[PDB]
Subunit: 155 residues, 3 copies
């Protein structure tokens, strides 16, 4: 079994809604990014790639490469997941922590778990997401952006 | 074995002392929270619940529910731990990292390990806490508040 | 198998270059620290010590003790690693995440993996490093300093 850690941040920008863990969540402002900027998933992806010892989402799916523009992060995830399985690993489980002041991630979480467990091809019981604010402190607390951490266990 | 990640933050406020990992630590300012605002423990709790795939402390013990007011976080911990054991898991080990500029967590750490290992019902050797500042950088570095991360392994 | 989490931050200061994961990386400003201030490694070290349940780099190699001045963090690492092996543990694998806006960690990463895998005495396949910025947000995003997280699995 191997461990892995991930982390991503994205600045709010423009109109909403935002995409987190696959769910289109309505919010005043949106998020700025080359891809769909789904922080929850990018975080999960790195943690997954990290366990696989394949580096990070950045070595694999460049900001520069235009094809990755508006890119559905779930695709990136599924691919990084493919390559991981090829390296002969299998999902132990993943845990994602969304550090955001807003919007309210809570109600969307189950749907996220559905999307993530699908992409990874596991049971929801192997995919856990949770959320938390930084109590008005920090860029996250100021509403400047969303951050997200994630850890994962591969076999 | 399953992994889990947690993270909490609390703004300083009012008179001290503060409570971290169960220890009443003297400090000029205190911490603002619905419960006792023990960051070290909330962080541990989420990480524990995350491994159990039970979500987070928020789905289980609401800011809104008044009973959780001034609430001894160790209780919340012990309960989240109970439910976890019921799901058939057992403590692999936990690691907590306190990111605070002040007060000096160091001298209180052993007592924390005592409290945490009790609550979890393991040996201190399965509970590790450590501390670090952000070098005057950030809300933590500015003394605006304390943050704390934690990871855990369940079986 | 045991888990472990680490985290460090260092303020930029003076002339470059900086040292991360062992690599001397050229950059305008440098980093302020009692030791060489290699964040990547300190982060790895704590995570390693955390899994071993030996506490943190701070309980073992003091800012105050002058010998640790300008100290090659790899030494600190190798020692913390020694003591860990003595406690009867062996490297499962480690994952390091550098949260820095600049300089570009990417090209130096392989050399880092070489240094880290040497120090730990494992194969590069057990040492993974990755990098990420906070999108101009935060002290890291403002270029005020570098932060770094790391997780580790011991056996
Ligand atoms: C998948 C993409 C493109 O579609 O998504 P978006 O960022 O557009 O949302 C990106 O490649 C996802 O980029 P991400 O890795 O999560 O955050 P970035 O700040 O863009 O990091 C880009 C790359 O630069 C490297 N890097 C990062 C920070 C730093 N100080 N030094 C570095 O060398 C890292 O190896 C990383 O892979
Ligand atoms: C145990 C309690 C109550 O006694 O402690 P205190 O916060 O008062 O200290 C709280 O429930 C402990 O709250 P905590 O989860 O650690 O931090 P909060 O910022 O209050 O998050 C509350 C809940 O809202 C959800 N949430 C959080 C942030 C966000 N952007 N969107 C969300 O949907 C999360 O699912 C979380 O469970
Ligand atoms: C290895 C050394 C010395 O050569 O490196 P440098 O910091 O000079 O680079 C230090 O001991 C590496 O210090 P580090 O632990 O990573 O960050 P620091 O902010 O200096 O934390 C110092 C110690 O104080 C304790 N501590 C920290 C923060 C806090 N709020 N309360 C505490 O009690 C921790 O137990 C930690 O071990």
């Amino acid at each position: 079994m191997r461990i892995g850690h991930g982390f991503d941040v994205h600045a709010f920008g423009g109109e909403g809604p935002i995409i987190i863990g696959g769910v289109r969540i309505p919010y005043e402002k949106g998020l700025l990014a080359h891809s769909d900027g789904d922080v929850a998933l990018h975080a999960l992806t790195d943690a997954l790639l990290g366990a696989a010892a394949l580096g990070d989402i950045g070595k694999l799916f460049p900001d520069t490469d235009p094809a990755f523009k508006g890119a559905d992060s779930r695709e990136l995830l599924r691919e990084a997941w493919r390559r991981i399985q090829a390296k002969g690993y299998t999902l132990g489980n993943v845990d994602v922590t969304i550090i955001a002041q807003a919007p309210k991630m809570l109600p969307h979480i189950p749907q996220m778990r559905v999307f993530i467990a699908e992409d990874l091809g596991c049971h929801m019981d192997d995919v856990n997401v949770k959320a938390t604010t930084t109590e008005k402190l920090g860029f996250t607390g100021r509403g400047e952006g969303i951050a997200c951490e994630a850890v994962a266990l591969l076999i």
